[PDB]
Symmetry: D2
Subunit: 396 residues, 4 copies
């Protein structure tokens, strides 16, 4: 049977050290889950699983989907869990949700993700047996950018270093990177004033006490010449800056995964059905490229071609990387009309575990507005993976 995506929402996205700094990963996940339960008016004991992508877990919130479920209201009967496949976790959550619905096992579940990058722990592995060795304290954000490909493939400079390796290989200009970057920002400010972001966003309360419903990172005044001033993050004379990559961010996303039968039974409005998905492994040092083998596998299974897709959500982890995926797909200037229309990672940010759910929110809602048929969501994944899902619109 089919699996259908209803009421895909998300908090606004905050900067690392910005407006949501006082709020935990749970706090955000809780608001977003209450926001979904409110808009859909579902009976709480109807949710059979809360499955959340979450990339910097710790003992503050074990099996985070269960914690978010309890802390948000839901009864003691609702199970939950945590998934990590780095940048692709939000979509991993969704795919897992779809699988356990389509098998007949569950009729309705929550899929989403939660990231408080502002609040990721500092940790040590030296304090338990004592520090022969000294004691090191790792920053969970810094340290995660160097360990994702294991011992045999270290990458000291993180995903940032891997996005330099793609610029090198596919010969992509600084001008073009920033030119993509301006598009992202303009489409993000334009999507705000167009009012279309209000349906995606659950407003979040925070104390000084006020309510916030506008994303923090998108700037109207961003321009090409302004961007060209910025310093490329010494080791290489020849293009990635805080301006042409996505930053570190706070946010959560939720959506309901269900059958058309059950959706009709509870007054729900299906926006899309999962046609297919693909996963892939590429070189850690070339992680950016992940969407290519994965988009092939998902298109292959859907018996479809890249040109049948009316809308594409490709995460802009780094502009160089986005363009490199766009080289492989043989993308010309006309293709930007159908790619990240409400913006993406560079303007909005990349709150790792929640990104998946945000892209789904924008894919399934713009696809229902343009009355087009097919959508693709794909992203690279630190450590050298890529994940893609092909979605199709639902009619009445």
């Amino acid at each position: 049977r089919d699996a259908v995506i209803c009421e895909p929402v998300r908090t606004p996205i905050g900067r690392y050290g910005g407006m949501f700094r006082s709020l935990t990963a749970v706090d955000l996940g809780v608001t977003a889950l209450k926001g979904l339960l409110e808009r859909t008016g579902i009976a709480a004991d109807q949710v059979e699983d809360v499955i959340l992508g979450h990339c910097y877990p710790n003992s503050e919130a074990p099996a985070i989907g269960r914690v978010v479920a309890l802390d948000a209201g839901l009864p003691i009967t609702v199970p939950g869990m945590q998934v990590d496949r780095r940048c692709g976790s939000g979509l991993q959550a969704v795919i897992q949700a779809c699988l356990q619905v389509r098998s007949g096992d569950h009729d309705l579940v929550v899929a989403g993700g939660a990231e408080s990058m502002s609040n990721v722990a500092f940790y040590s592995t030296d304090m338990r047996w004592g520090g022969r060795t000294g004691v090191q304290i790792h920053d969970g954000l810094a340290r995660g950018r160097t360990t994702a490909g294991g011992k045999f493939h270290p990458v000291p400079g993180g995903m940032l270093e891997t996005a330099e390796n793609l610029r090198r290989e596919y010969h992509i200009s600084r001008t073009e990177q920033d030119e993509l970057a301006v598009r992202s920002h303009q489409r993000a400010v334009a999507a705000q004033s167009e009012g279309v972001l209000a349906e995606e966003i659950i407003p979040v309360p925070v104390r000084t006490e006020e309510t916030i419903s506008v994303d923090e990172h998108p700037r109207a005044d961003t321009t090409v010449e302004a961007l060209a001033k910025l310093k490329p993050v010494k080791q290489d004379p020849e293009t990635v800056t805080a301006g042409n990559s996505s930053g570190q961010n706070d946010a959560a996303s939720m959506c309901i995964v269900t059958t058309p039968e059950k959706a009709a039974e509870l007054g729900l409005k299906p926006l899309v059905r999962l046609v297919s998905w693909g996963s892939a492994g590429v070189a850690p040092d070339l992680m950016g490229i992940g969407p290519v083998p994965a988009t092939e596998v998902a298109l292959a299974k859907a018996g479809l071609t890249l040109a049948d897709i009316d809308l594409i959500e490709l995460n802009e982890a780094f502009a160089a990387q986005a363009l490199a995926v766009m080289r492989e797909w043989k993308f010309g200037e006309a293709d930007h009309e159908r790619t990240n229309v409400r913006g993406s990672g560079i303007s909005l940010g990349h709150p790792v575990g929640a990104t998946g759910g945000r892209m789904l929110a924008t894919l399934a809602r713009e696809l229902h507005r343009r009355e087009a048929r097919y959508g693709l969501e794909t992203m690279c994944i630190g450590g050298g993976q890529g994940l893609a899902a092909v979605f199709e619109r639902v009619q009445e």
Copy 2:
């Protein structure tokens, strides 16, 4: 189509601060995955996913299944990931594996789990913006996790240990019975060792010599010499001790999840097929009871009754808890003949993320030995969850 479990293996299980202390969660997961790829002789680019349950993750090893995969040999094309549904994570890994095989999406994946409890981080959420106002706290990931799993609305200061005190209270279970169940666990563990049957489950681990024997099982384990101080002063009638509960442990487990078609194509030997599974949520303060609503849901879907099950793997997180699940199932002394035959959590230990895969190893292999038909794997899950899977033997 069917999903089938092949060559379910696991490292030996070490004590917290015991023989495996020098080795990381990755180290264990790597040995075990190499051990699986060596016994089955599969071509590495055949594995389409490494899915690992892993309960105390950190930035040493993000999306741990991918990490374990590269660090063990496999090519850059094998995807991987990490799951957490606490004690049920190993089985969560297996169920996800089965789902994405049965859907036609993948033909072959690795399911498993890795836990280094010896090497769980200390951490702080105060060091980033600074501790002027607030001071700086450092949490022990093991201690701190036993108090946060039910959230703000359901705190449990004393951990899963305190919830296992709540079950003894409700279901009026004696200390004698607890420790008597504990002796059976140990005897079945030492007996399963000398019977040589554990050698097929265990991948030997090298450590800066080679080890292939579990560290926690003691032959000299006795009813009297146990009848030890009950951990939790707050309660006069308190009964749970380091002796009648499962400790903290190091280990990893792997197994192949595939179709009978593909298993035949690579010379593999399917031990079981996943018939059904169920998940449930219970009270966090009553987590130990999780197997009950979960076992109903899994039996219900299989159209089966608790009595059609020839073998049961119920995790002995705490003896009180295991007996409480056994009250509900209306278990008499004859039922212990079909329950945790090669031992369980109290004698072997509970290396959280790996437990699922261990039980599956002992379920699938003893079910093939006794030539019986149906198996059940179920466990309670910190924070008030239960998970169950019903497995059937293959011909």
Copy 3:
């Protein structure tokens, strides 16, 4: 046993905890101030025979801090140095030790001072070396934790020196009405320009600062503020106590012979000094037994003293010492004339040097004869020195 004389007593400006000097270490401040002293006196560096610094929150960033400050500030590898801790009295402790080793004939010239970065005091643990498997891991704030351990196991004081400054209000029945004088004397001493001779300007990256951060020109009504009470219905606030602060002080300690030889200008000579122990829970009172011992040795009476520097750790405490000395409103004409701890702050290890700066320089301006410097000390101690003007 010849005379010991105090030359060119200088100090940095005093910054708030988390204020202007936050970017700068204990060493940084010490260094500036020692450079500022060696610049105004024009001494040959190899002339300093010891750098002796009071310093109350030391750590392995800067072991034997006086040595470190000496090297980091220019002085040659032949200049020795060290660190002293007698809490609030360390600055004066450093001076007294400097005077003792000069008067014995052992050294002809030494530097005495102190250095405190309260903004940069370490967080530390005693659980991370053998492991926190049994015990958990605690991390103390070196400021918070120091305010509870100074009296040892047999005399704990949970609320710190703050709690002891309540115990004095309770005992000597001193009213909340009875801090503004401190502030007015501090702002007035600034505009009078007299502070410019005390202060070595500090560069912070890159502007230069030479004005103390804490003194405000703008009142009694203030009476608004919340007493730090929940435990006690009846009066100490962040407004009527001295805060936590950054600063350093330096001065030269030498003989009149050697001072004349290098063109130096002796401001005072150390007549006498006294130390005392009182109850930890009543630490504020320390100046009393100590001021007796120092007056007794100088064969002098409290009324022969033309100028008094009593550290205003907490206003309650300062008045309690003033009750004991039988002080009437006319006595405030001769006490903390350029201000004190409440308006200026209490950068622990540097306070001693600051008071000496203001004591020796105001005494030379007024052309009066005798000075007293005295302060309470966390853990229950009191130190006093009696100083006499020169030429």
Copy 4:
């Protein structure tokens, strides 16, 4: 002035880093030793006018440690106290400061000593207060970190005092054989001094059992046994000092009374020595081990004495290479080892930084009273490039 005299100079036994005294704090040790002094001398507590302690790894556990030790050991709320740090020379710094404030007429009786728990030295950070957002967070080991900062920015020494003790072997061409020969002597004199029973008068026993024997001295220490050890920095230097020919890291405390012969007579005390003179000096940080040289000159010069008038010498054996280098400068022949570190030293006993000074004083003053000789020298190198020396003279009764 008048004289300053040293009475009943005592110390705890010296423990290894991570050894028998691991459960005990710097305070704990300082407290036992102070109680042991107050018990053997039977002094009225309110007679102590200052507790002055050398202490090299202080922290907020015990501020102005001398005051803390005083309260924690019994003495009344009227006894003042404090902490000094001049690294290895702090125990002697404490004594010199004691003597100065006694000789000036200021105090009649004070306690001088030192306390070090190297086993319990804090791990610390300067990044946790305003946050490690920009910078990350570092945690320094107070022992490791102190061996690299003592000479400041303009003179860093990555390998610590260990690296400086090699610079001396290099300069003064001192052989490995010789280093380890000194090292056997130290051990033999330390085990011999134990069985001779002479260490029992120096040592306050520490408490559940009681312990009164030093942990580090081994009777079985051999020349061949030691030659089989790996030079700690052999990797950076082919010709490179070992855990066997240098002093380790250690736990201990020392106390002693500083007073006048008048007051000593008034309380039934037995003055062992009087402080004749002292000197301090600064040398190169990278050459710290040499500090005793310019310091010993200054102290001898002030006493108007010559190095040959000294009947007994306590030179701290921080590192055997360093001890010998000071011995080269003093023109020492094999006969001089008869009057140097007779009850042992740093290599056999250990170097509990802040307590070393008091220990050497204990051995100097007591052996000088036993041999009925006249003059003594106590000198040691100091991390960061300093040296301190005191000349002591026996008192005759």
